[PDB]
């Protein structure tokens, strides 16, 4: 029948491909730091790997917190308001400035965290140097995230791609200058990767500020002309809308850290295969998270037009595109399950164990698109808190216990890490059932409370 489904699908492939390119650039920014410090030593590679493992969960909190700012400016721009957007954007910038402080303190406590994991003194000092270098980058990253939330909300995902790509291609020379002490810069070494990431983040922030000021496309909003004074009432309002979608992004990462802790007794050739499979699944997850963000933008815009049916159609085409791309990338994992496992490592025992685990990772990838797209879909509906309840009670209550029961115990022959992955499937499923049934209730509720909650 198609009708409007093909039209909405095409408008969703665009506005989401640039987001995918931006996300691959963001991950490559850390990949380059790791693979370029490995050309100096192995200590400097492990240091900038542990520092990244401590840096990602901390900054994901604020990154999630600003995804409440995204559909707020999406809804206003959709209705035709476009004159209270500047106030909200300025208040969000101040909110990013404020939320930078706790993250900076937590990263300042890095030296204590790296004692509870048996890190030698050389790796510890290199990790602390990296963290104390990227602390200066933290506020610029949060401000850039807020600014890209403004531009994304107006359905303009192109700039963050370019400024993203220019970032990645500017990390290659700046790393080289500082790690190897060229062009008069000090020979920082492996620590130089952090002091180059800080510079590239400030450069990206400056470039995005420049684009918003001139643009000629966003010139109608005139964001940086009035400089609205801070208001604590709104600042609290925009924190209660973003905290639930940051708690979930924190708890997912903590769940996987805990599973890494629990699978450690199973050996050392099993944890390596586990982390290989998990790392590949992380990129295949980068694939449908881009669809979810675009769906959130589209449903926010359509609720602004007071088009409930249009919002529903956009959500459904997003939930279909996610499943289709998930099937495509799951089949390519099942076929090329050995070549991908040979890019990571050269231990054939590890490549065999990871070739077996990348068979459950395929079903994992198929379920972790119906989860993510649905989570993004109702986030546009301003149903933040619901996420935090259904995602949490499905992740921690289900997956971690059934992972332990079907894994290291036999209260059901104990299975290996292929039991933890089965628990992951059991959690991601029924996460994609609670988050999928909440959406169905929302899409069929009174045609008025939908819009009213869409303003909440």
């Amino acid at each position, epitope marked *: 029948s198609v009708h409007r489904y093909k039209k909405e699908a095409s408008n969703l492939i665009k506005l989401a491909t640039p987001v995918l390119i931006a996300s691959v650039a963001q991950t490559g920014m850390g990949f380059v730091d790791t693979i370029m410090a490995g050309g100096v030593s*192995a200590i400097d*590679m492990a240091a900038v*790997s*542990i520092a990244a493992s401590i840096w990602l969960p901390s900054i994901l909190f604020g990154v999630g917190l600003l995804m409440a700012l995204v559909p707020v400016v999406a809804q206003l721009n959709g209705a035709g308001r476009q004159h209270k957007i500047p106030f909200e954007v300025h208040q969000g910038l101040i909110l990013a400035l404020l939320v930078s402080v706790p993250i900076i303190a937590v990263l300042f406590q890095t030296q204590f965290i790296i004692r509870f994991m048996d890190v030698e003194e050389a790796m510890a000092t290199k990790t602390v140097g990296y963290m104390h270098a990227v602390i200066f980058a933290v506020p610029a990253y949060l401000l850039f995230q807020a600014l890209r939330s403004f531009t994304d909300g107006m359905s303009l995902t192109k700039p963050a791609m370019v400024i993203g790509f220019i970032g990645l291609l500017l990390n290659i020379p700046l790393n080289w200058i500082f790690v190897y002490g060229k062009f008069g810069a000090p020979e920082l070494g492996g620590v130089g990767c952090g002091v180059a990431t800080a510079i590239v983040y400030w450069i990206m922030l400056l470039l995005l500020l420049f684009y918003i000021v001139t643009s000629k496309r966003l010139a109608h909003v005139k964001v940086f002309e009035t400089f609205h004074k801070p208001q604590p009432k709104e600042l609290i309002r925009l924190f209660r809308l973003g905290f639930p979608v940051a708690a979930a992004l924190f708890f997912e990462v903590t769940l996987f850290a805990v599973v890494a802790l629990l699978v450690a007794p199973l050996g050392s050739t099993v944890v*390596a295969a586990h982390q290989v499979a998990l*790392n590949f699944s992380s990129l295949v997850f980068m694939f449908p998270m881009s669809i979810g963000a675009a769906v959130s933008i589209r449903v926010g815009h359509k609720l602004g037009e007071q088009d409930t049916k249009g919002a529903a159609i956009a959500a459904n085409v997003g939930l279909m595109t996610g499943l289709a791309t998930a099937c495509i990338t799951a089949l390519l994992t099942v076929l090329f399950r050995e070549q991908i496992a040979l890019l*990571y490592t050269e231990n054939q025992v590890v490549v065999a164990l990871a070739m077996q685990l990348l068979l459950f990772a395929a079903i994992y990838q198929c379920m972790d698109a119906v989860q993510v797209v649905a989570a993004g879909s109702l986030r546009g509906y301003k149903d933040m808190t619901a996420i935090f309840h259904r995602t949490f009670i499905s992740y921690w209550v289900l997956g971690l216990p059934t992972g332990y029961i079907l894994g290291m115990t036999n209260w059901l022959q104990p299975l290996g890490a292929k039991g933890f992955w089965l628990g992951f499937i059991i959690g991601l499923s029924a996460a994609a059932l609670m988050l999928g049934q909440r959406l169905y209730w929302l899409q069929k509720q009174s045609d008025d409370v939908q819009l009213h909650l869409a303003a909440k």
Partner: nanobody
Amino acid sequence: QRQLVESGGGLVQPGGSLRLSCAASGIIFKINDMGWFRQAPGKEREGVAGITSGGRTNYADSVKGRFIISRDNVKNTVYLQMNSLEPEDTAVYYCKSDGLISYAASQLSTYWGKGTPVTVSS
């Protein structure tokens, strides 16, 4: 044992030169750093030389000017050239390799070697 295979050794007269080699398999070896450790009877295992991923040499104290470590990446080998060997150098030399097991791991992994005997005397 399997990851690292040492090769070389034998009876070297004092003042002679020897060239030990260490072949690595199952290791990325482009990001793993290598080293050589001697262990004579009565004494404790100690380092002799070590090279990083960037080719930085870190010879021991009473090894300077006598031992030169080299490394190849096309064929995964670590060479140790010993010159002006004295009767105090007789020991079993072990090839140690530490570095990330894969591109997704965080903590580095260490692999030892079986070791090759080296006896210096008339």
